[PDB]
Each structure stands twice: as structure tokens, then as C-alpha cells.
Design a protein around this ligand. Structure first.
Ligand code: NAG
Lengths: 50, 49
């Protein structure tokens, strides 16, 4: 800590960013691409991969 | 812990220790005392005070 210089903590902390990434992964695994364009539509992963 | 010949101390700008009196010495750290800005939260002047 020097004189006249301070660092502002990020608004969105590490835990929230991890939660956001986990939510994106869960959506893209259990719903494919339909969750990014409306309600999340479930679909089995082999069928999504096909 | 400073080698018993120096008198001042600094790493970037200033963190001097040691009392500069020939009678006696005493290691005293140097650092500010929590300066900072101040911010105010307000929902709006035309909805509350
Ligand atoms: C605040 O709200 C009132 C009521 O809607 C409006 O007349 C006014 O223009 C707004 N802004 C200020 C600065 O008062």
C-alpha cells in the first residue's frame, strides 16, 4: 500500500463468476442450445451430440 | 531485523526505522493510517433523502 494509490475490489467476486460458469455449463449440458434462446428445454446428451 | 550499522530503511519510497538519537535506538515502522475516499449511496433525490 503506497501513498495516493488504492485498488477497488471487483464488483463481481470470484464465487459469483464460478457460479455463472457452472450455470452456463449445466445449461449447455442438460439443455443444449435452447436455454440461450428462451426456456431451457431438456434433452438427453447423446441426442444433443447427434 | 536490520544489520546493526544502518539508520534508514526503504523498499520503494520510505519505511524507515531505528531511533536516530545517539543515546538510544528503537525500531519504529513507518506506514500511513488508512487514508481513503468516501462514497455516498442514494436511491434518488426525488424519491427520498
Ligand atoms: C422526480 O420525480 C418527479 C415526479 O415524477 C418528477 O416531476 C421530477 O422531474 C423527477 N426529477 C427530479 C430531479 O425531481
Amino acid at each position: 500500500k503506497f501513498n495516493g494509490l488504492t485498488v477497488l475490489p471487483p464488483l463481481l467476486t470470484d464465487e459469483m463468476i464460478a457460479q455463472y460458469t457452472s450455470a452456463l455449463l449445466a445449461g449447455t449440458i442438460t439443455s443444449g442450445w435452447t436455454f440461450g434462446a428462451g426456456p431451457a428445454l431438456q434433452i438427453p446428451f447423446p441426442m444433443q451430440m447427434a | 531485523k536490520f544489520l546493526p550499522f544502518q539508520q534508514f530503511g526503504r523498499d520503494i519510497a520510505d519505511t524507515t526505522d531505528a531511533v536516530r538519537d545517539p543515546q538510544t535506538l528503537e525500531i519504529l515502522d513507518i506506514t500511513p493510517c488508512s487514508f481513503g475516499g468516501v462514497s455516498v449511496i442514494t436511491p434518488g433525490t426525488n424519491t427520498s433523502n
